[PDB]
Amino acid sequence: EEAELAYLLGELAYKLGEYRIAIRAYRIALKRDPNNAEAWYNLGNAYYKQGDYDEAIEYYQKALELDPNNAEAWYNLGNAYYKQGDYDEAIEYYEKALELDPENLEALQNLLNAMDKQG
Amino acid sequence: EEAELAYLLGELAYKLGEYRIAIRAYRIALKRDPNNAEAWYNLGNAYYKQGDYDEAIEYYQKALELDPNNAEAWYNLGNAYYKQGDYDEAIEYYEKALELDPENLEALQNLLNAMDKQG
Amino acid sequence: EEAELAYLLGELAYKLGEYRIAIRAYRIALKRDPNNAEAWYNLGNAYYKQGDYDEAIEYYQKALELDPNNAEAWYNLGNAYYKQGDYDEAIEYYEKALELDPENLEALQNLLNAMDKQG
Amino acid sequence: IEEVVAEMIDILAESSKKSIEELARAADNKTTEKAVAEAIEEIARLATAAIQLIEALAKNLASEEFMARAISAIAELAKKAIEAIYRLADNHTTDTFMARAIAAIANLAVTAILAIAALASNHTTEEFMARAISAIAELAKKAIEAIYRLADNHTTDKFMAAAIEAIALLATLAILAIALLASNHTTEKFMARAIMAIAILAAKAIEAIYRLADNHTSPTYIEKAIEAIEKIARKAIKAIEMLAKNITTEEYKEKAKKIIDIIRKLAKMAIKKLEDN
Amino acid sequence: IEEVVAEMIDILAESSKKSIEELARAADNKTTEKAVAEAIEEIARLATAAIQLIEALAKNLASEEFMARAISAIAELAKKAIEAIYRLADNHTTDTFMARAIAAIANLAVTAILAIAALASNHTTEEFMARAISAIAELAKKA
């Protein structure tokens, strides 16, 4: 099962902070299995960690289509939009993350900040 | 040789303490090559480290059928039985580990303790 | 793409200092793709790090045939020859590394030392 | 005339800033705690006096451009005094002079804020009132952060309660000062800005308190932190409602409600976590 | 507006009163004369500053009910500062810090009295002016 090994290599490298490696390994795992929502999410996270926000947004969105209840992905999607200055989108996604998980204090604070920057 | 890569990923993750990853990688390596005694042994060790003693026992036993001279596996098999309260078995396996390696002080001490708990 | 995963596993293990693992993974990556100059180079480096200078020389030479502008490989090829006492070769390779990169202070110093040991 | 009054203000401000820097340098290069204590008190004493002289002169400036310059001079001096104290007073194994630093920072922030509001109330243009609101909010945030950071540099929980109370004080007065100036706005655009300024400051005050209280097991600090958090939310919300009542465009009232609900959630969530500790 | 200004005054007054009590406690439990000297000066310094901030805010209160609250806040803080100093500064074999205590008490009384008169002059009702007179007389007697 090359797809699982690709996944495992990706996860190990990711956990160790070796994002360059993690990205290549996840691309392989996903090429073989496009429905791996977790790999899409972590692929997006590796880009996010590198400041590659455009990629982080695309991949977070795919992970969410596969799994709409991933509150953390909603939160980070909002964060990437926020970082790019897209406050209208940041608000929309922080609100979803909170509906799924009201305990996310960071989302509440970032939500309020996005509202300040908005218009 | 996917089986060797699975083995290598397993060993790297194991060495780094990432037992969750090591287990999945070893299962793949063994699925492809059931005679890999070393992988069976390390598979059992990863479970042992996690407190998963029932699995550690099964896998240690398989590694030993493939390689009866593995004193360390005999020792750890005895330890898993000991941890579960099976003192009769712990005694039997500590004795074998010692026949293979008389220098194992821990086995001697655990052997005596198992004898105390026995009956 | 097993060859890429083999490469990635090799690079991760190498970076972490697990040269035993890195070597086996690189051998697999190269078996599948003999033109991977970078893998040849890092394969040679893992041996170099272990004191396995004969292997380090062979693999550095292959990496260089594939990529003659690799100043670092020229430098390390010279270092392996130097370590074995082959000062005539060490001189030849330090000079090439310097032609490619004049800033390599270590090559200049080692070059002068090789000249002292020479004849 | 305005030129003369404004020049006198700029002169006093430059003299005061230089003196603060020199006091800090004089003590920063010493190994004597007493030298530092004197610099902490002298910086605060000087900045306070300078602010009061500026206010007295600033009252003779009828023009908005000039009042804005006076406000800036006060705000700049006050923030410089706070930074000088934060650095000057840091470390000391966290056992010596932390109480002085907290009190000094909070006291300077109070004087500067009230002084700004005192002058700011004479602007008749919403744009200028908005600038004053920002100046108050920025001073309040800087004072809160300096106090917060000193409190978390601590090696032991000595004086964390002072930090908790000082933050609650500054946030409460700054909120009221904003509401006070904001009560003179007539356009929803500006009323909305005042509401966000309050909400944000309230959120920052709550988070700083929460984090300090949540850093270690501390049942009596938890009791203080919880009341401070609820207190801040009460003041922030009432201020928002008072301003919100003057909005007649609806969409803006909906936004004010969202803001209030966010504040309520922040207070409740922060409290629940502190209660569980 | 009056509600806001009045609230700010009450807040400053409560903070100031607590701090005076704490300074007195911190020094009351010490055996070092210097700790006491600092508390004597800090109580007076603080109360003086607090009074001045209250006066500045109080000037924005046109309503008599609110001015009366501001007057009370000044008077209450001033008398608390005086009591704290009296107790804090007592004894000391009567050789140490009596001069500081006398000056501090008299100076606080002067600041508080003049500040009250400054606000009190804006009442237009005889009943309120009478309250201010009483407040002044009580501070003078306590000092």
Residue numbers in the entry:
A (entry chain A), B (entry chain A), C (entry chain A): 1 to 119
D (entry chain B): 1 to 277
E (entry chain B): 1 to 143
Q: What are the paper's exact sentences on this?
A:
We sought to develop a general computational method for de novo designing protein nanoparticles with geometries tailored to present antigens of interest, focusing specifically on the prefusion conformations of the trimeric viral glycoproteins HIV-1 Env (BG505 SOSIP), influenza hemagglutinin (H1 HA), and respiratory syncytial virus (RSV) F (DS-Cav1). In the first step, we de novo designed antigen-tailored trimers, featuring N termini geometrically matched to the C termini of the viral glycoproteins. In the second step, we generated tetrahedral, octahedral, and icosahedral two-component nanoparticles by designing secondary interfaces between a designed trimer (fusion component) and a de novo homo-oligomer (assembly component). This design approach yielded nanoparticles tailored to present 4, 8, or 20 copies of the viral glycoproteins in defined geometries.
As secondary assembly components were required to design our antigen-tailored nanoparticles, validated trimers were docked pairwise with de novo designed symmetric homo-oligomers to generate tetrahedral, octahedral, and icosahedral nanoparticle configurations using the TCdock program. Five designs comprising a panel of unique geometric configurations, T33_dn2, T33_dn5, T33_dn10, O43_dn18, and I53_dn5, ran as monodisperse particles of the predicted molecular mass by SEC-MALS and were further investigated by SAXS. The experimental solution scattering curves closely matched the scattering curves computed from the design models for all five designs (metrics in Table 1 and Figure 2—source data 1, bottom five designs). In order to obtain higher-resolution information, three designs, T33_dn10, O43_dn18, and I53_dn5, representing one nanoparticle from each targeted symmetry (T, O, I), were subjected to cryo-electron microscopy (cryo-EM). The final resolutions of the reconstructed maps for the T33_dn10, O43_dn18, and I53_dn5 nanoparticles were 3.9, 4.5, and 5.3 Å, respectively. There is less evidence of flexibility in T33_dn10 and O43_dn18, in agreement with the higher final map resolution for these nanoparticles. Nanoparticle design models were relaxed into the corresponding EM maps by applying multiple rounds of Rosetta relaxed refinement and manual refinement in Coot to generate the final structures. Overall, the refined structures show excellent agreement with the corresponding Rosetta design models. Backbone r.m.s.d. values estimated for the asymmetric unit (consisting of a single subunit of component A and component B) were 0.65, 0.98, and 1.3 Å for T33_dn10, O43_dn18, and I53_dn5, respectively. The self-assembling cores of the antigen-fused T33_dn2, T33_dn10, and I53_dn5 nanoparticles were very similar to the NS-EM maps of the unmodified nanoparticles (at least to the resolution limits of NS-EM), demonstrating that fusion of the BG505 SOSIP trimer did not induce any major structural changes to the underlying nanoparticle scaffolds.
